[PDB]
Amino acid sequence: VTVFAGPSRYTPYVPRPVAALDSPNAIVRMAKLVEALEEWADNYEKRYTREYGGGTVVPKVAIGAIRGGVPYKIYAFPELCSIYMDIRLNPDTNPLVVQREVEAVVSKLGLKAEVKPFLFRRGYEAQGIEPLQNALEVAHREVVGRPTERPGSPECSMWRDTNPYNELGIPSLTYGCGGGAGGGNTYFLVDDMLKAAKVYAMTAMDLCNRTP
Amino acid sequence: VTVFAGPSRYTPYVPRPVAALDSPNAIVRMAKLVEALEEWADNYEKRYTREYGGGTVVPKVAIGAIRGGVPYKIYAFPELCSIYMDIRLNPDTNPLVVQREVEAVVSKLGLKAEVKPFLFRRGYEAQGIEPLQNALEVAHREVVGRPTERPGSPECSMWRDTNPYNELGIPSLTYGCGGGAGGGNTYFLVDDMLKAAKVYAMTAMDLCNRTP
Amino acid sequence: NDVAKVMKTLDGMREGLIQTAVELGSIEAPTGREGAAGDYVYEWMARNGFGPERVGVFDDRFNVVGRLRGTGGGASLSFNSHLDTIMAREDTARFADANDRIYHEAWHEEGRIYGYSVVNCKGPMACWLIAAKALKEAGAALKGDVVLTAVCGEIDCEPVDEFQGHDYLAEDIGARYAISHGAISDYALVAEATNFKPAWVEAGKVFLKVTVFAGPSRYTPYVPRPVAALDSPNAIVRMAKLVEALEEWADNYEKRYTREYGGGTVVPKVAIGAIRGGVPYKIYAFPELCSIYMDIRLNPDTNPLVVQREVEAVVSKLGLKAEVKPFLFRRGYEAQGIEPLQNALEVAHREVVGRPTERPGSPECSMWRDTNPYNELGIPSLTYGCGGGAGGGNTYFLVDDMLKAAKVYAMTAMDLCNRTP
Ligand SMILES: N[C@@]1(O)CC=C([N+](=O)[O-])C=C1C(=O)O
Numbered sequence: 001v002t003v004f005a006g007p008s009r010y011t012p013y014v015p016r017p018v019a020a021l022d023s024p025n026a027i028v029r030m031a032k033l034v035e036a037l038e039e040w041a042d043n044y045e046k047r048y049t050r051e052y053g054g055g056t057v058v059p060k061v062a063i064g065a066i067r068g069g070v071p072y073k074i075y076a077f078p079e080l081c082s083i084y085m086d087i088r089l090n091p092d093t094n095p096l097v098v099q100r101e102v103e104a105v106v107s108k109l110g111l112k113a114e115v116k117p118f119l120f121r122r123g124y125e126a127q128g129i130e131p132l133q134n135a136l137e138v139a140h141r142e143v144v145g146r147p148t149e150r151p152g153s154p155e156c157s158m159w160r161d162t163n164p165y166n167e168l169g170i171p172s173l174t175y176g177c178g179g180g181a182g183g184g185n186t187y188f189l190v191d192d193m194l195k196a197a198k199v200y201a202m203t204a205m206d207l208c209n210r211t212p
Numbered sequence: 213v214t215v216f217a218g219p220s221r222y223t224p225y226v227p228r229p230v231a232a233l234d235s236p237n238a239i240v241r242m243a244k245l246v247e248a249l250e251e252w253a254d255n256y257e258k259r260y261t262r263e264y265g266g267g268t269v270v271p272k273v274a275i276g277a278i279r280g281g282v283p284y285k286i287y288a289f290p291e292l293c294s295i296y297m298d299i300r301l302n303p304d305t306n307p308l309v310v311q312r313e314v315e316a317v318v319s320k321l322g323l324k325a326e327v328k329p330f331l332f333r334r335g336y337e338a339q340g341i342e343p344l345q346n347a348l349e350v351a352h353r354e355v356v357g358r359p360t361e362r363p364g365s366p367e368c369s370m371w372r373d374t375n376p377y378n379e380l381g382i383p384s385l386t387y388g389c390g391g392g393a394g395g396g397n398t399y400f401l402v403d404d405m406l407k408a409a410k411v412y413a414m415t416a417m418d419l420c421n422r423t424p
Numbered sequence: 425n426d427v428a429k430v431m432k433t434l435d436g437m438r439e440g441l442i443q444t445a446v447e448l449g450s451i452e453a454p455t456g457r458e459g460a461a462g463d464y465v466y467e468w469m470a471r472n473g474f475g476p477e478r479v480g481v482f483d484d485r486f487n488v489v490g491r492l493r494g495t496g497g498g499a500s501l502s503f504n505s506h507l508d509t510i511m512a513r514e515d516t517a518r519f520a521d522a523n524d525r526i527y528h529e530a531w532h533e534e535g536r537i538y539g540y541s542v543v544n545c546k547g548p549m550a551c552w553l554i555a556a557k558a559l560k561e562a563g564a565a566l567k568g569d570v571v572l573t574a575v576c577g578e579i580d581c582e583p584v585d586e587f588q589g590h591d592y593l594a595e596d597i598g599a600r601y602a603i604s605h606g607a608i609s610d611y612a613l614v615a616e617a618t619n620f621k622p623a624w625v626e627a628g629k630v631f632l633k634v635t636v637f638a639g640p641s642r643y644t645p646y647v648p649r650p651v652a653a654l655d656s657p658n659a660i661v662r663m664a665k666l667v668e669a670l671e672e673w674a675d676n677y678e679k680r681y682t683r684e685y686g687g688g689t690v691v692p693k694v695a696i697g698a699i700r701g702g703v704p705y706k707i708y709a710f711p712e713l714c715s716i717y718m719d720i721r722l723n724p725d726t727n728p729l730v731v732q733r734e735v736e737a738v739v740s741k742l743g744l745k746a747e748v749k750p751f752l753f754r755r756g757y758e759a760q761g762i763e764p765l766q767n768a769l770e771v772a773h774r775e776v777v778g779r780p781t782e783r784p785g786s787p788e789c790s791m792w793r794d795t796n797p798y799n800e801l802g803i804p805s806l807t808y809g810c811g812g813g814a815g816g817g818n819t820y821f822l823v824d825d826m827l828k829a830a831k832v833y834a835m836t837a838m839d840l841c842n843r844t845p
């Protein structure tokens with residue numbers, strides 16, 4: 001998201017006072033836009049929260065980076081300033097809908113900005129997961145000693161390489177020991193690692209002996 | 213000026229809603245600080261305006277760059293964000309006074325930040341300029357045909373290489389034909405230029421025949 | 425109170441003081457190759473948690489600036505010493521006794537630390553590094569910051585003629601560069617070996633290249649003889665007479681421009697530091713020009729041009745034709761508003777050393793110190809430290825003196841940094 005402003009001036013010529021949204025300094029305008037997008041992000045995850053058999057997706061938003069101007073030439077403020085947004089998508093949301101929503105936030109502030117996608121990947125709920133799900137559930141109940149619970153929302157609201165497998169028709173789920181790094185956890189119990197290894201081994205001995 | 217926040221989280225784990233000043237995203241906090249600093253900048257140029265024989269200095273402030281996170285890894289928001297401020301000084305203001313004012317702005321918002329100076333140069337009013345000022349004025353009155361006009365504040369409130377001459381005890385003033393590219397001018401009348409070249413030559417024919 | 429705790433801490437740091445000074449002092453760091461010395465100081469500041477930054481024009485010749493952050497609302501104080509040392513292992517053009525151990529090594533023996541590189545200036549540097557360490561580790565309460573500034577290129581080397589750039593630069597890339605790029609504070613103490621005598625005036629300088637012209641050159645079998653020296657077609661012979669005239673001028677120059685300030689008495693001196701005429705590998709025809717290079721100190725109130733004109737008048741009186749070309753000019757300053765630092769220092773000193781500070785001799789007020797860049801930039805600055813002067817020149821520090829200096833530095837900071845700016 002790149003906000004435009006200007007014209008740039010050598011600092012000794014900068015016009016003041018000027019209201020934030022009118023500032024010739026794109027950085028100053030972008031500061032107000034950041035606040036609007038934080039508000040949009042607060043509600044976005046609520047609006048696109050969606051329950052699936054495979055987990056409950058809570059798609060979140062964050063502003064991951066910002067840059068405007070360059071630190072080794074700061075005597076004239078910049079006419080443009082960019083932020084870079086990470087917007088998670090539930091599997092049923094078209095990226096263009098989201099782009100439009102962000103463009104709408106921009107126009108409501110009355111700002112001129114380019115809203116440009118530079119990454120889009122789809123999320124998937126596995127189809128036909130039952131044989132693996134079952135092989136896993138049996139091994140898990142046996143090794144860990146209790147039925148599985150549904151995963152926390154963050155853990156099925158992220159990127160994992162189940163997406164590429166499911167995309168390519170290979171039903172895939174994610175499972176392992178320990179809290180999520182993104183959470184984030186710092187260590188594994190060797191005991192848990194052993195359980196996981198046993199669950200994996202048992203799952204294979206079951207599933208790999210069923211007929212394709 | 214580097215604002216601290218955190219802890220960083222993978223986007224699917226970001227806590228919301230959180231009040232801007234309390235956001236774990238340093239970029240969001242910085243957006244708030246930019247507002248306050250703009251307000252401070254508006255008053256700073258008022259409070260430190262100062263009249264000198266050689267011009268009236270209106271020292272201005274601008275935010276010339278911002279950066280937080282990096283564009284190519286945006287999946288976890290940054291725990292720090294930095295802006296780079298250009299703060300002009302009248303010749304009689306100690307940079308530490310200014311640093312401490314900026315630090316006060318930060319503190320009043322309840323924010324944790326490092327305010328780090330990375331450049332300091334003094335400005336000067338020429339001392340003992342009279343012989344040059346007069347030799348110039350005489351040549352100018354002849355060539356341009358009227359008394360010199362006092363210069364606009366921006367032209368007295370910027371950086372010029374008169375500063376190092378004056379610093380080193382060589383009385384120095386700035387003078388030439390044209391509108392200030394600061395500013396925003398983009399052309400020179402050849403006639404004006406020829407007038408300037410005449411003023412310069414006359415200024416020298418006078419001054420360089422003064423005995424030291 | 426806090427003072428007593430810090431004094432105790434410093435008492436227990438003698439071994440760190442010795443080791444730091446000897447390790448630093450052992451690093452070859454002639455002006456031009458101070459990089460390794462800077463690296464050591466950077467890593468020392470980093471280990472001790474002073475958050476150092478390399479602040480430099482070149483990546484292998486830089487200043488190191490660290491910080492002990494105060495709690496807020498107090499005056500900040502810089503401590504400063506330089507990383508470069510005098511003797512390059514190659515300097516046999518200057519000194520007959522090149523590469524004697526004292527010029528290139530540093531070692532502890534019998535409560536002494538020997539080495540010219542210790543006297544100038546790793547010893548005083550170690551003193552305030554230790555002082556800063558003690559302040560931090562004792563948890564001394566300081567409202568203001570202590571700025572820790574180790575600078576490259578303090579020594580009076582300068583580019584000239586074909587000797588340009590990276591290898592020959594010094595003061596332009598040193599202290600003034602460090603301060604201009606962030607190492608600012610309310611006050612600054614420059615740690616140099618002054619035998620516990622404080623100075624807050626120093627000289628400026630103008631370097632002149634004086635080139636006498638003569639000619640026409642002749643192949644030796646054709647040289648005209650006899651000819652009066654001043655009329656000699658050989659510029660070297662004419663220069664010989666000029667050198668004597670300039671020595672006479674120099675003799676009186678220092679008297680005429682002697683000047684007593686509050687911060688000390690400046691006696692500005694003159695020396696002829698180099699000469700060259702012709703080239704040694706082609707001597708069959710004498711040269712039509714010959715150049716000397718003059719070091720002329722300036723009291724703070726002398727314009728370089730006045731001096732240039734005076735030297736031009738010496739030339740003219742001899743009836744010679746010469747070019748008198750300045751290739752260096754720096755101003756000297758008397759500190760202004762030095763009192764809070766002067767007083768905190770005086771109090772610390774009287775306590776630690778036991779008697780009032782004695783007034784510095786003229787030479788230590790009539791040279792280049794990095795107090796000039798500080799004062800130039802509005803940071804009132806004086807010079808103070810243990811040991812007989814390097815230009816004296818002393819060859820070792822008493823470890824006891826070094827410790828006193830460290831204590832004086834620590835107390836000075838605990839006083840000044842708790843005053844309101
Ligand atoms: N003093 C400067 O050269 C520096 C910077 C700009 N500028 O922002 O384009 C203009 C100047 C000017 O007035 O010439």
Ligand SMILES: N[C@@]1(O)CC=C([N+](=O)[O-])C=C1C(=O)O
Binds near residue numbers: 160180182222287
């Ligand atoms: N999907 C990841 O591997 C990538 C990114 C992070 N992270 O930013 O902490 C966590 C993941 C995880 O633990 O599943």
Ligand SMILES: [Zn+2]
Binds near residue numbers: 506545578616
């Ligand atoms: Zn020294």
